[PDB]
């Protein structure tokens, strides 16, 4: 309960009179109450690392012992709140202090202790019902979209002897008093869970449903699933926040720059979404974790664990969370400097030896689960990491030890950026290992797409092993089946994998229109191949350069598929246009032969 | 045996990372297992790291997050880490520590074997003789694996080496013209490839051959180091005491060495070359050299390690030392995976250094030597014509360089291309291999001698 | 005439597409029920050999439990 | 060509027939798998009850005193 500072030495504090102190448990160092973490016991002393600036901490300062490690507050009031990497609400320290600064040792509640929430019990409990860890006993109308479900803590069970009457409550009163055998206890409306502990589940279901990202590339050739893990080495993350099939977004910037973090907090309360014809601010179904590089280095490493623990909490209600964890490589640079303070031996380029263990302890909390509780729920957490290598390599220990863990790699390069292509998709080092899990969704609902996806990845590959000779030799003595797979292959690279994100046709790409565009482009490839191979020996052998001059008006309708608006036009107004065009592609070849 | 009761200390002198250091210990053994129980009740396990007089440094497996030096009880065992082996564990799925995860019961032991293992007497080895038939044509036709060979599969991240390993395990057997088993160790896997391995082998009907050790990525990095030693002590019971032929597949041995580098640096050791431990050559050798046939027993162990080369580097010390102890390589290639070929196995760099003893008459068939090096020459001469055709065009190639480009369109799509469920037996990877060698006349096949050209070409 | 091979010739191989549909109904009743007879026969081979060796190994167990021998560690 | 329009439909119904016959062997493998587990649990229950008889025969010695001192 009481320690004393025996000696500080930089951000590491040695405390005495700490006999029963646990590892990684929280302490309040100093007279200003700096939050710390016990990292090394030696007998009755306790080496503490301080989560704040240590200047002015004398010896003989009191060290309060709490009994609980670094943990977040879970409850109603989270959605819309701007937190820190140790969950300090930055939109309320700016009010209760009325300054531009974060003073040392602030103790602001992470959830507000003044807002009255409308409690609604689950109408199937009573005074004398049996309830165990995970059973929903309340519903809070947090805002219009989120039905905030109150849940029992895991490893807590018994019989209810007090349920709270439906009304309006704050997050401090005693809403639930169930009893275990002999001992009565009390539950509030907020719960507290340690950020390095996995929130428990019943079973981990396979991730078999596609995460609809709003784009044409990355959703046909390299698909992601609900419950999957990606890597992006803001137009891919802002697109998922408006249109995708996720009900809670969690944006976690670990060590991002100050002006690029003040950019996002300016932009998200202006964004809108389309729910039922009404427009709604997207800051009703997201919560950010703001963290810059001026912040404590101990609160930058913990921002990833706070972000996924917040992400796992809204999973258990039954929502499908999608967490974007921006700048994973900044998070590893927080692991490099903690390990240097401990005098830990580095393994690879100064990074600790456990860089892969900590990343697999974060990326493997994603996935579709069967949620712990009574009403048979099902939620999921998608994690979208973002490695920033030192100039686009797989040599650093952060980029290469992410690709040994994740399943999707949305591999981007810097050379393929000045084409004004936008995205900077590479499609040679980018993969997706959710092609075998999605062989049931594609074959049942879409039943045609896997052989077109097999061909369309091949046409863009045969172009590569031609293009080195097309540069050096230059199209002089070439076969005519290769001129198909350079002009049809060019038609893909400007009309299928080409985007521009502020336009009224290319901010959402629905998937039935996405397979509708490839249903014509592969058919034009195979009919150009079947023409050139059966008319290779008989009489009046043709090349490509007699077709593209003759069928110049066919190559305009096959190039004006990306410019049809998916938003103004009808749902069936776009497939018939792609089904009428096929008979302008089946009859058109029968005008040459 | 060990009939004395066990001491349960609560004299913890400190915690420093994953190390718990006790004091006033009565005669502590080295590498002895302890069982820590936390204040709240969570039982964790750990292994003794260093003894010094009355001290003991214990490396807790599941971390030290919640251990205090006042109320933690650390019960010593007195015996080192051993496994229970049985023949009825063929058909189970264990994790890295050896506990079942297939809703199964605990394995009733026939023996308790020390998992570190003793080396084999080098006089008591026999040279590998017969063939292990995998079912993949690219490693049975031209890169054949003996009985007792150690041949690693070299690949990279993103490449489908994990489905090659699952297709070997479904179809591995003998070379038929009751004693075959497979011990599949999976180190450093994620969840979505752990339920690929757990689901593929159990509903493709051949779970009864395979004993699956699945060590996850989120599981402790010490439990990844005892995973290939649990799998090889099971294989050394099943083969050298039950006379089975065992195939030992170790998946992603570059993930063993990333957990060995992590366990070494958390033991407060100083790293060696490229950050890896200095004893990395004699640490893989304790795994790889648990193989081969033995004198006086009818079993064998053939190993197939699998590697992931970072940045396609070969001078990295995980492929450097694997190619230094093991005999050949397989070389899953990236330029074939982008062209949609399964399995994407490159032939030109791959090699089996004991392939000339696993083939022949009375082992596979008489022409398996002369077919394989003939398809190897025509695969190389075609791939020069494949690049040369782009330089000069099609109108400048003769009726010689068209036989090699028409063979090359059918060697990659019929010999290399297999599909994941098509078990080509080795008698059918030669008839595939002959009906590509009929695109050429008998005046062109230089690598085949004329006596077997008369017996196998005209059909 | 050959364009009439679209809507009539598909009902020729539908006698093969229906051939396994009733052969999905035949092997089903003997799948689970016949192996359930073997998972009961294999159990009665355990308990037949359980009672012939129970009192033998209960005496070796309880006899070794009630052993007094107080050995010391060396020094 | 009348030959050809059979086989493009036949390939849509050799593919379905290679599918259910694979689906037949999944059912036979999922039941032979739990066959070995249900018989391995009926070997574990006989052991964990043999120790329950050795836990009750152990307490028939603590009632004694000349054999327990």
């Amino acid at each position: 309960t009481f320690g004393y500072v025996h000696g500080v030495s930089g951000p590491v504090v040695t405390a005495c009179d700490m006999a029963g102190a646990a590892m990684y448990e929280l302490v309040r160092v100093g007279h200003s109450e700096l939050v710390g973490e016990i990292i090394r016991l030696e007998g009755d002393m306790a080496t503490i690392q301080v989560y704040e600036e240590t200047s002015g901490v004398s010896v003989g300062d009191p060290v309060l012992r709490t009994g609980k490690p670094l943990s977040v507050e879970l409850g109603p009031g989270i959605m819309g709140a701007i937190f820190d990497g140790i969950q300090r609400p930055l939109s309320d320290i700016s009010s209760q202090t009325q300054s531009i600064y974060i003073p040392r040792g602030v103790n602001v509640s992470a959830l507000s202790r003044d807002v009255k929430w409308d409690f609604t019990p689950c109408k199937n409990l009573r005074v004398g019902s049996h309830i165990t860890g995970g059973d929903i006993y309340g519903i809070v109308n947090e805002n219009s979209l989120i039905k905030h479900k109150i849940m029992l803590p895991p490893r807590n069970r018994g019989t209810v002897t007090y349920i709270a009457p439906p009304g309006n409550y704050d997050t401090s009163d005693v809403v639930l008093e169930l009893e275990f055998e002999g001992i009565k206890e009390k539950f509030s409306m907020v719960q507290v869970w340690p950020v390095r502990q996995v929130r428990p589940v019943t079973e981990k279901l396979p991730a078999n449903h596609p995460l609809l990202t709003g784009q044409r590339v990355l959703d046909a050739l390299f698909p992601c699933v609900q419950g999957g893990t990606t890597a992006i080495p803001t137009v891919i993350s802002q697109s998922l926040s408006k249109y995708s099939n996720s009900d809670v977004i969690i944006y976690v910037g670990c060590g991002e720059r100050g002006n690029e973090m003040s950019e996002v907090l300016r932009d998200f309360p202006e964004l809108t979404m389309e729910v039922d014809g009404k427009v709604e601010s997207i800051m009703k179904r997201t919560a950010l974790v703001a963290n810059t590089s001026n912040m404590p280095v101990a609160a930058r490493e913990a921002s990833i664990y706070t972000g996924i623990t917040l992400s796992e909490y809204f999973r258990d209600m039954g929502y499908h969370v999608s967490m974007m964890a921006d700048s994973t490589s900044r998070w590893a640079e927080a692991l490099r400097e903690i390990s240097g303070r401990l005098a830990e031996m580095p393994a690879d380029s100064g990074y600790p030896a456990y860089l892969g263990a900590r990343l697999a302890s974060f990326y493997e909390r994603a996935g579709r689960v069967k949620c712990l509780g009574n009403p048979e729920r099902e939620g999921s957490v998608s994690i979208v990491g973002a490695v920033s290598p030192p100039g686009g390599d797989f040599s650093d220990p952060v980029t290469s030890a992410t690709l040994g863990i994740v399943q999707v790699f949305w591999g981007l390069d810097k050379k393929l950026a000045q084409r004004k292509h936008f995205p900077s998709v590479n499609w040679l080092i980018s993969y997706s290992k959710y092609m075998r899990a999605l062989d049931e969704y594609y074959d049942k609902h879409f039943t045609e797409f896997v052989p077109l996806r097999t061909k369309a990845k091949e046409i863009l590959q045969e172009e590569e092993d031609l293009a080195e000779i097309v540069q050096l030799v230059g199209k002089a003595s070439l076969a005519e089946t290769d001129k198909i797979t350079l002009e049809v292959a060019k038609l893909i690279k400007d009309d299928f994998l080409q985007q521009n994100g502020y336009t009224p046709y290319d901010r959402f790409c629905p998937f039935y229109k996405t397979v509708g565009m490839l249903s014509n482009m592969i058919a034009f490839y195979d009919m150009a191949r079947r023409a050139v191979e059966t008319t290779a020996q008989s009489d009046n052998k043709i090349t490509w350069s007699i077709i593209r001059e003759h069928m110049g008006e066919i190559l305009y309708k096959l190039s004006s598929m990306k410019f049809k608006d998916p938003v103004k036009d009808g749902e069936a107004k776009i497939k018939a246009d792609y089904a009428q065009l096929l008979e302008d592609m089946q009859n058109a070849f029968r005008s040459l032969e | 045996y060990l009939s004395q009761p066990r001491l349960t200390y609560k004299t913890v002198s400190g915690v420093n990372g994953p190390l718990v250091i006790l004091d006033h210990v009565k005669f502590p053994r080295y590498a002895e297992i302890v069982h820590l129980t936390l204040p709240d009740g969570t039982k964790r396990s750990g292994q003794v790291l260093e003894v010094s007089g009355s001290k003991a440094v214990v490396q807790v497996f599941e971390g030290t997050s919640g251990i205090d030096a006042k109320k933690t009880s650390c019960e010593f065992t007195g015996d080192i880490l051993r496994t229970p082996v049985s023949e009825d564990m063929l058909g189970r799925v264990f994790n890295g520590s050896g506990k079942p995860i297939d809703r199964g019961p605990v394995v009733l032991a026939e023996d308790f074997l020390d998992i570190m293992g003793q080396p084999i007497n080098p006089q008591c080895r026999i040279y590998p003789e017969e063939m292990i038939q995998t079912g993949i044509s690219a490693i049975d036709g031209m890169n054949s694996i003996a009985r007792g060979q150690k041949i690693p599969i070299f690949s990279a991240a993103g490449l489908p080496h994990n489905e090659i390993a699952a297709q070997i395990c479904r179809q591995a057997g003998l070379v038929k013209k009751e004693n075959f088993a497979i011990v599949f160790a999976a180190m450093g896997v994620n969840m979505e490839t752990a339920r690929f391995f757990k689901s593929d082998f159990e509903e493709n009907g051949s779970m009864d051959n395979v004993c699956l050790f699945l060590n996850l990525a989120n599981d402790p990095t010490i439990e990844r180091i005892i995973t290939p030693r649990l799998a090889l002590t099971t294989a050394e019971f099943l083969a050298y005491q039950c006379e089975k032929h065992v195939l030992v597949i170790l998946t992603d041995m570059s993930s063993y060495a990333e957990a060995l580098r992590e366990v070494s640096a958390a033991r407060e050791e100083v790293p060696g070359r490229r950050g890896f431990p200095g004893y990395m050559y004699t640490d893989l050798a304790t795994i790889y050299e648990r193989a081969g046939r033995v004198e006086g027993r009818n079993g064998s162990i053939t190993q197939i390690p699998i590697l992931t080369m970072p940045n396609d580097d070969i001078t990295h010390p995980i492929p450097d030392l694997t190619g230094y102890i093991t005999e050949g390589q397989i070389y899953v290639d990236r330029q074939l995976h982008n062209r949609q070929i399964y399995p994407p196995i490159n032939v030109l760099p791959s090699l089996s250094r004991l392939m000339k003893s696993a083939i022949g008459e009375g082992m596979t068939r008489k022409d398996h030597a002369d077919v394989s090096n003939q398809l190897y020459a025509c695969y190389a001469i075609g791939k020069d014509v494949q690049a040369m055709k782009a330089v000069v065009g099609e109108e400048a190639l003769t009726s010689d360089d068209l036989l090699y480009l028409e063979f090359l369109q059918k060697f990659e799509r019929n010999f290399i291309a297999q599909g994941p469920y098509e078990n080509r037996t080795v008698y059918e990877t030669l008839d595939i291999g002959w009906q590509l060698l009929r695109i050429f006349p008998k005046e062109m096949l230089k690598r085949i001698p004329q006596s077997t050209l008369s017996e196998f070409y005209p059909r | 005439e050959a364009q009439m091979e679209v809507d009539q010739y598909r009902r020729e191989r539908e006698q093969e597409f229906q051939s396994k549909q009733q052969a999905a109904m035949g092997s089903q009743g003997n799948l689970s029920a016949e192996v359930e007879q073997a998972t009961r026969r294999q159990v009665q081979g355990m308990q037949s050999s359980q009672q012939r060796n129970r009192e033998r190994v209960l005496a070796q167990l309880l006899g070794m439990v009630c052993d007094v021998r107080p050995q010391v560690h060396p020094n | 060509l009348v030959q050809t329009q059979r086989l493009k439909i036949m390939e849509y119904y050799e593919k379905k027939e290679k599918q259910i016959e694979q689906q037949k062997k999944i059912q036979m493998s999922n039941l032979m798998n739990q066959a070995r587990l249900k018989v391995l649990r009926a070997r574990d229950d006989l052991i964990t009850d043999l120790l329950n008889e050795a836990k009750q025969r152990l307490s028939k010695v603590v009632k004694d005193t000349t054999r327990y001192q």
Side-chain angles (χ1 to χ4, degrees), chain B residues 47-73:
Chain B
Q47 175 222 35
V48 168
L49 184 61
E50 162 186 338
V51 304
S52 157
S54 312
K55 272 196 174 146
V57 163
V58 160
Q59 178 189 334
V60 191
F61 286 179
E62 284 86 8
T64 51
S65 170
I67 295 176
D68 54 356
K70 199 94 161 183
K71 308 186 302 307
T72 296
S73 317

Side-chain angles (χ1 to χ4, degrees), chain A residues 73-74 76 92 96 107-117 169-173 188-192:
Chain A
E73 293 209 357
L74 309 164
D92 308 317
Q96 299 178 11
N107 205 323
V108 175
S109 169
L111 288 190
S112 299
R113 307 286 139 86
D114 211 1
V115 48
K116 306 284 277 188
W117 304 101
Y169 295 77
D170 63 342
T171 39
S172 289
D173 45 32
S188 160
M189 222 197 311
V190 301
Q191 74 190 245
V192 167

Side-chain angles (χ1 to χ4, degrees), chain B residues 70-85:
Chain B
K70 199 94 161 183
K71 308 186 302 307
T72 296
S73 317
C74 180
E75 162 169 5
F76 272 46
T77 318
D79 207 317
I80 70 185
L81 186 51
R82 301 160 182 272
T83 189
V85 284

Side-chain angles (χ1 to χ4, degrees), chain A residues 302-344:
Chain A
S303 85
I304 278 300
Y305 301 105
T306 282
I308 186 53
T309 313
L310 281 186
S311 199
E312 280 179 335
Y313 179 56
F314 291 97
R315 186 195 57 186
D316 305 352
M317 316 179 158
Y319 302 102
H320 298 262
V321 193
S322 195
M323 155 165 190
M324 162 66 189
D326 189 273
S327 314
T328 309
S329 44
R330 294 291 165 260
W331 176 85
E333 289 198 331
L335 255 188
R336 171 152 62 191
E337 307 169 8
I338 301 308
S339 174
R341 295 293 189 173
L342 309 183
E344 272 203 339

